[PDB]
Every structure is written in C-alpha cells, then in structure tokens.
C-alpha cells in the first residue's frame, strides 16, 4: 500500500523494518502528563527512561513501534516525537478510543467519532500535523452500545483512509468474534484488523478460526506474567497468571497451523503509567528488565529453539507489520 505516517513524517514501507505492533511510551489520560509531570518524577525523567528503553530495543533490532495510546489513554504526540527522534526509532501514533473515554467522547454519535478519527488521520493530532497511522478500539466485558458505536466509527475511518484497526480485547473473554461481526457489517476487510491481546487466551480453536478469516492475531503481551508475584493483587490483575512461554507458544501454535502470515507480536510495554496503581512501572520492570527488547532478545530465540525457521520469524516481525500498516483501501 502507501507510505506509513510516523511521528517524524511519512516513511517508505521498506524502512519500517522489525516492528513492535502494540506498545506504549506512557499510559495515562488526556492532558495528564502536562498537568502533573511530577507524577512521573518529571517529564525529563520519563523522556530519559523511554529513550534509554527504546535504544535498547533498537540495539536488539527493533526499527519501528506502533504506539497505540489514544487521546483518552493520554497520548502526548510531542512526547512521542521527542522520544522517536532521540532513540532514532520510528513511532506510529494512534487515533481511536481506549477503555476510559471522557463524557466528551461518550456523548458522541457514530458520525461524530468517525469525524474525530478522520481528523487525527487526515489532518493531524492537535496542532502538530502529526497524523495517526492506526485506529485503536478497546472493549472489556460484554459489548455496550457505545462500544459498537466506536467499532463502527473505526471501520468507517479505516475504509475512508486505508489505515488499519487494532483492538484491545479484555480480559480473556474472547471478544474477537463479537468485534469481527460488527467490522464485517460495515464492509471492513479482516486484513485491516488486528484482534489484540489474543495471547490472553489458550483457546486455539478461537484463534485459528479468526486467523482463517484473514484477521491479524495480536499476540502482544508476551512478557506479562505475575507468576512469582502472587502476593501482589495488582500485578495479577494487570499481567495474568500465565507464563511468557505459554503466551509465546501460541505464536508457534498458529505457525504450525499454517497461519504465520496472520500473526503480529509485541510486548504491550510502557515506560510510565498513571492509569493504574502508583509505581506500577516498577513492578513491570522487575518482571521484564528487557522492556520492549523482550521480543527480539527472548521470544525470537525461544521460537527458534522450538524449531521455527528464521525466515518465518522474519516474516512475522517484518513482513506482516508492513503489510498491516501500509494503508490499503
């Protein structure tokens, strides 16, 4: 398809490289970083931590991350740009709606939210001219009317622009079938959609049937595991009780079923978070000191060790994300 918009401008598909398809520099809420930077120690400290972390990912071979932080999760596109330039890693920014829409979003019609996603894709985010490269939607629980409205607006925005849609499916309730029904009712191609956090379930029948329809399957919280931290209830709620190897083996399972082309792999990492319990980044850092480099440093060799061909792993980490991100009407 087309070139891809990043927070440093449009880049050629050939320059995307090894891509982490679901990441965050900072998880918060709109305007939060600007209003209370000292929550993160300082804006400067957060920038330093993110740049260091992204450089380590880069040394490990990562060339692009997709930051799927929305307006309501506190996307600060100036932060993303500063960090992208200093780490020299491409960052694709997002539009869409996560789990915490304010009333200003919850009161909107499907037409109005389609207009908001389009502005962020076609014109730019705020007054920056930086255009979103991906539409993020999030649902948890059983779907609400508002969730359906958001999915329809995302589908309509994707159809008008070619940019893909990524979903947050929480927590293991296997919501992809419910989401796909709505996407398809709007005429959206499954090839434009990633059903994210699919690694939260071990239901391979569910995963395979979505893959077979041409959905991308986001196996993208691989390092998250609270095993060993059972005394911390907040760790278990956020990271789950399944090992990173259990998650990673789903990648190999879908490969072995013939669906290598449908797999997107990431960490769903963060360098700062205020949307949850205080200091939770410290708990994450203790589980996975590799941060975003976890995928290339730990998961790729694990999968090779289990017999996955290197070409297959390159197709999953380079070719699939390029095919996914490249705008395609």
In degrees, rounded to 5, the angle at the alpha carbon of residue 34 between the alpha carbons of residues 76 and 107 is 65
Of 53-61, 108-116, 118-126, 166-174, which part binds Zn ion (CB under 5 A)?
A: 166-174
The encoded tokens of residue 208 equal 């395979």
Question: Within 10 A of 50 (CB to CB), how many other CB atoms are there?
Answer: 25
Binds 38, which of Zn ion, a second copy, none (CB < 5 to 8 A, cut-off by type)? Answer: a second copy
Q: Is 126 in the site for a second copy (CB under 8 A)?
A: yes
Binds 29, which of a second copy, Zn ion, none (CB < 5 to 8 A, cut-off by type)? Answer: a second copy
Nearest approach, Cβ of residue 93 and a second copy (Å): 12
Tell me the backbone φ, ψ of residue 32, rounded to 5 degrees. -65, -45
CA gap 139, 142 in Å, rounded: 8
Q: Is 298 in the site for a second copy (CB under 8 A)?
A: no
Q: Is 32 in the site for a second copy (CB under 8 A)?
A: yes
The answer to the question of whether 224 is labelled as a binding residue is: no
Question: In this structure, are residues 225 and 181 in contact, taking their beta carbons and an 8 Å threshold?
Answer: no
Looking at the DSSP bridge assignments, the partners of residue 265 are 219
Size of the site for Zn ion (CB under 5 A): 2
Q: Is 85 in the site for a second copy (CB under 8 A)?
A: no
Phi-psi region of 32 (alpha: psi -120 to 50; beta: other; left: phi over 0): alpha
The one among 17, 50, 63, 74 contacting a second copy by CB under 8 A: 74
Binding mask 204-243 for a second copy (x = CB under 8 A): ----------------------------------------
Q: Is 108 in the site for a second copy (CB under 8 A)?
A: yes
Nearest approach, Cβ of residue 187 and Zn ion (Å): 25
Looking at the DSSP bridge assignments, the partners of residue 23 are 67
Q: State the DSSP string of 256-324.
A: HTT-GGGEEE-----SEE-SSSTTHHHHHHHH-TTGGGHIIIIIHHHHHHTT--HHHHHIIIIIHHHHH
Nearest approach, Cβ of residue 32 and a second copy (Å): 5
The answer to the question of whether 197 is labelled as a binding residue is: yes
The answer to the question of whether 168 is labelled as a binding residue is: yes
Provide the total of helices (H) and of strands (E) in the chain, helices listed first.
15, 13
Binding site for Zn ion (CB under 5 A): 168, 268
Residues making up the binding site for Zn(2+):
22, 24, 136, 168, 197, 268
Binding site for a second copy (CB under 8 A): 28-32, 34-36, 38, 71-72, 74, 99-100, 102-105, 107-109, 112, 116, 119-120, 125-127, 274-278
């Amino acid at each position: 398809g087309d070139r891809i918009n990043t927070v440093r401008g449009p880049i050629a598909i050939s320059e995307v490289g090894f891509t982490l398809t679901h990441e965050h520099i900072c998880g918060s809420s709109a305007g939060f970083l600007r209003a209370w930077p000292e929550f993160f120690g300082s804006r400067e400290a957060l920038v330093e931590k993110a740049v260091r972390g992204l450089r380590r990912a880069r040394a490990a071979g990562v060339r692009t991350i997709v930051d799927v932080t929305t307006f309501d999760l506190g996307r600060d596109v100036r932060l993303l740009a500063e960090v992208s330039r200093a780490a020299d890693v491409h960052i694709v920014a997002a539009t869409g709606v996560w789990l915490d829409p304010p009333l200003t979003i919850r009161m909107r019609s499907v037409v109005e939210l389609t207009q908001f996603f389009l502005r962020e894709i076609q014109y730019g985010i705020e007054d920056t001219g930086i255009r979103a490269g991906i539409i993020k939607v999030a649902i948890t629980g059983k779907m609400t009317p508002f969730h359906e409205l958001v999915l329809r607006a995302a589908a309509r925005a994707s159809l008008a622009t070619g940019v893909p849609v990524i979903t947050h499916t929480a927590g293991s309730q296997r919501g992809g079938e419910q989401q796909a029904a709505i996407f398809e009712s709007e005429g959206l191609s499954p090839s434009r959609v990633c059903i994210g956090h699919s690694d939260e379930t071990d239901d391979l029948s569910y995963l395979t049937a979505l893959a077979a329809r041409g959905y991308l399957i986001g196996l993208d919280r691989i390092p998250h595991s609270a095993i060993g931290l059972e005394d911390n209830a907040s760790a278990t709620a956020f990271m789950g009780s399944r090992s990173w190897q259990t998650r990673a083996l789903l990648i190999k399972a879908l490969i072995d079923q013939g669906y290598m082309k449908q797999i997107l792999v990431s960490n769903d990492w963060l360098f700062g978070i205020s949307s949850y319990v205080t200091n939770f980044t410290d708990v994450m850092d203790s589980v996975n000191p590799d941060g975003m480099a976890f995928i290339p440093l730990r998961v790729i060799p694990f999968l090779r060790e289990k017999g996955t061909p290197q070409e297959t792993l390159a197709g999953i980490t380079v070719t699939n994300p390029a095919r996914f991100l490249s705008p395609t009407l």
